[PDB]
Amino acid sequence: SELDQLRQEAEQLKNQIRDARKACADATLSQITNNIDPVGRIQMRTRRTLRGHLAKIYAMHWGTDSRLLVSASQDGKLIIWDSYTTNKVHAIPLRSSWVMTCAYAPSGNYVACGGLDNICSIYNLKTREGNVRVSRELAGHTGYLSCCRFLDDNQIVTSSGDTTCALWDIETGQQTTTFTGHTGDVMSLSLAPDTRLFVSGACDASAKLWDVREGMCRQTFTGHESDINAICFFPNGNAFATGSDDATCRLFDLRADQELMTYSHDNIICGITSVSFSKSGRLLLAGYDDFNCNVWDALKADRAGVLAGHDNRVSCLGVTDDGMAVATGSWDSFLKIWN
């Protein structure tokens, strides 16, 4: 046969990779950071509870003004809130009950969500005629929308349970660029600051780094022993974090091309659902299927704090652009802000 004269070649290239990396691995971050002062106790407190959804919240996302934030829920509704007051800006009844993600265009103008309709719906929020109406439905995926993020008002990236991501031209309504490689449901993604790259994580327990502009996969990181549920870029864009059903987070570095760190405890057993960094990147926030949300020293791997507030899975969460505060969503149906 010819397939085993190539699957054995797959094993001898995997190892030249396992080689270049073990040769880069002179020291470890936990050794290089051993000297700096510990971060101290992070005992943040709930400051706003946002009440409105009638069932589980599945996703949420700050608008770039760190004031407004979209959330989506089992109640087929999408809320946009205004954290400073607690007021609702828009309640958006959806066409499909089964939503799973949501997103805020940086500009303010649109939001987007989708779910098991396999569609990514853009919504106009400054409709010429002072209204909120669907302004595009992006069909092409053959699986569920699992995440998405705009790059501007005309472009957006999606990840799907079909195992692919894509970049859309919203006018065109068609995939301008596709991203194959993953061997299982893509679950999260993070654009980096340059919005020239972007990383995805999936149920194949691998994260991948993609060139937006070209379409190709550049690097594949592994190490988790289970679905990667969430993923976040470190602020300088040279590194990123993940969360998995394995009960851990890890931070990876792009130029070192390997795993830097592991955050975990022998007590924490349920899976992470979301992750995100404080403005300096020094802290790594992480949600958990155990109703808690842990705050970590990204550089020393100690657990700096805990945000105990929900009565159900913390489905999602997210720090503000200006670093002022942290939102969390949960299955208990309430979003909570903390500071």
Partner 1 sequence: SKKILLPEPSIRSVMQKYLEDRGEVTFEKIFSQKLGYLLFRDFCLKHLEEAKPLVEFYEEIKKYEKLETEEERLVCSREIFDTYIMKELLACSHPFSKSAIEHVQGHLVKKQVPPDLFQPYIEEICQNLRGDVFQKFIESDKFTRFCQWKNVELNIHLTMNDFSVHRIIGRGGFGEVYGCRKADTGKMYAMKCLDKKRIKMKQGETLALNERIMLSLVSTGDCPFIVCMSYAFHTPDKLSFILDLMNGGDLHYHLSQHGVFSEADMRFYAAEIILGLEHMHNRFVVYRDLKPANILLDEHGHVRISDLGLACDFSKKKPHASVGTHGYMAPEVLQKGVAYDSSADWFSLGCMLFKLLRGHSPFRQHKTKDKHEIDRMTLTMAVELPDSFSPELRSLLEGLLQRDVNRRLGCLGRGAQEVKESPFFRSLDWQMVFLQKYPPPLIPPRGIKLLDSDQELYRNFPLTISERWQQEVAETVFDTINAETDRLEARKKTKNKQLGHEEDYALGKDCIMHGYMSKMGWQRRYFYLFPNRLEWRGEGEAPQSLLTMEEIQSVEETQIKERKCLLLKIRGGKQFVLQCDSDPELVQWKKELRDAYREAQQLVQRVPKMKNKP
Partner 2 sequence: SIAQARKLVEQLKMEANIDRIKVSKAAADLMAYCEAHAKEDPLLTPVPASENPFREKKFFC
Is there binding between residue 140 and partner 1 (CB under 8 A)?
Answer: no
Binding-site member from 88, 95, 126, 218 for partner 2 (CB under 8 A): 218
> Could you tell me the two tokens for 255?
């130029």
Is there binding between residue 130 and partner 1 (CB under 8 A)?
Answer: no
Q: What is the x/- site pattern for partner 1, positions 164-193, by CB under 8 A?
A: ---------------------x-x------
Is there binding between residue 159 and partner 1 (CB under 8 A)?
Answer: no
Is there binding between residue 236 and partner 2 (CB under 8 A)?
Answer: yes
Is there binding between residue 162 and partner 1 (CB under 8 A)?
Answer: no
The answer for 288, left when phi > 0, alpha when psi is -120 to 50, beta otherwise, is beta
Residue with tokens 């990181």: 221
The strand order across the sheet containing 314-319 reads: 46-50, 335-338, 326-330, 314-319
Closest CA to 117 of 92, 147, 142: 142
Is there binding between residue 124 and partner 1 (CB under 8 A)?
Answer: no
Binding residues among 306-325 for partner 2 as defined by CB under 8 A: 319, 322-325
The stretch near partner 1 (CB under 8 A) out of 20-28, 68-76, 205-213, 233-241 is 68-76
Q: What does the alpha-carbon distance between residue 169 and residue 3 come to, in Å, rounded to a whole number?
A: 38
The stretch near partner 2 (CB under 8 A) out of 86-94, 115-123, 147-155, 215-223 is 215-223
Is there binding between residue 76 and partner 1 (CB under 8 A)?
Answer: yes
Binding-site member from 63, 201, 243, 271 for partner 1 (CB under 8 A): 271
Radius of gyration (Cα) for the chain, nearest Å? 20
Instruction: Return the number of the residue (265 or 279) whose C-beta is nearest partner 1.
Output: 265
Distance of CA 315 to the CA centre of its chain: 11
Binding residues among 38-67 for partner 2 as defined by CB under 8 A: 39, 42, 44, 47-48, 67
Q: What does the alpha-carbon distance between residue 229 and residue 284 come to, in Å, rounded to a whole number?
A: 15
Interstrand relation of 314-319 and 303-308 (parallel, antiparallel or unpaired): unpaired
Residue 181, binding choice from partner 2, partner 1, none, Cβ under 5 to 8 Å by partner class = partner 2
Instruction: Return the number of the residue (58 or 252) whose C-beta is nearest partner 2.
Output: 252
H/E segment holding residue 19? helix 4-22
Strands of 129-182 (E only): list them.
133-139, 145-152, 155-160, 165-169, 174-179
Binding-site member from 17, 20, 24, 269 for partner 1 (CB under 8 A): 269
Binding-site member from 20, 32, 36, 54 for partner 1 (CB under 8 A): 54
Instruction: Return the number of the residue (289 or 297) whose C-beta is nearest partner 1.
Output: 289
Q: 30 CB contacts (<8 Å, ≥6 apart)?
A: 261, 300, 301
| Count of residues engaged in binding partner 2, rule: CB under 8 A | 63
Task: Answer yes or no: are the C-beta atoms of 104 and 96 closer than 8 Å.
Answer: no
Return the sign of the alpha-carbon dihedral for residues 266, 268, 273, 274.
negative
Alpha helix segments (H runs only) across 85-124:
none
Is there binding between residue 283 and partner 2 (CB under 8 A)?
Answer: yes
- Least gap, CB of 258 to partner 1 (angstroms): 26
Other Cβ atoms within 10 Å of 149 Cβ, number: 22
Residue 281, binding choice from partner 2, partner 1, none, Cβ under 5 to 8 Å by partner class = partner 2
Closest CA to 150 of 95, 182, 110, 179: 110
Q: What does the alpha-carbon distance between residue 176 and residue 198 come to, in Å, rounded to a whole number?
A: 15
Q: What does the alpha-carbon distance between residue 113 and residue 117 come to, in Å, rounded to a whole number?
A: 10
Name the residues that contact partner 2, by CB under 8 A: 2-3, 6-7, 9-10, 13-14, 16-17, 20-21, 24-29, 32-33, 36, 39, 42, 44, 47-48, 67, 83-84, 181, 216-220, 234-236, 238-239, 253, 255-258, 260, 278-283, 298-299, 319, 322-326, 337-339
Name the residues that contact partner 1, by CB under 8 A: 54-55, 58, 74-76, 93-98, 100, 116, 144, 146, 161, 185, 187, 203, 227, 229, 245, 269-271, 289
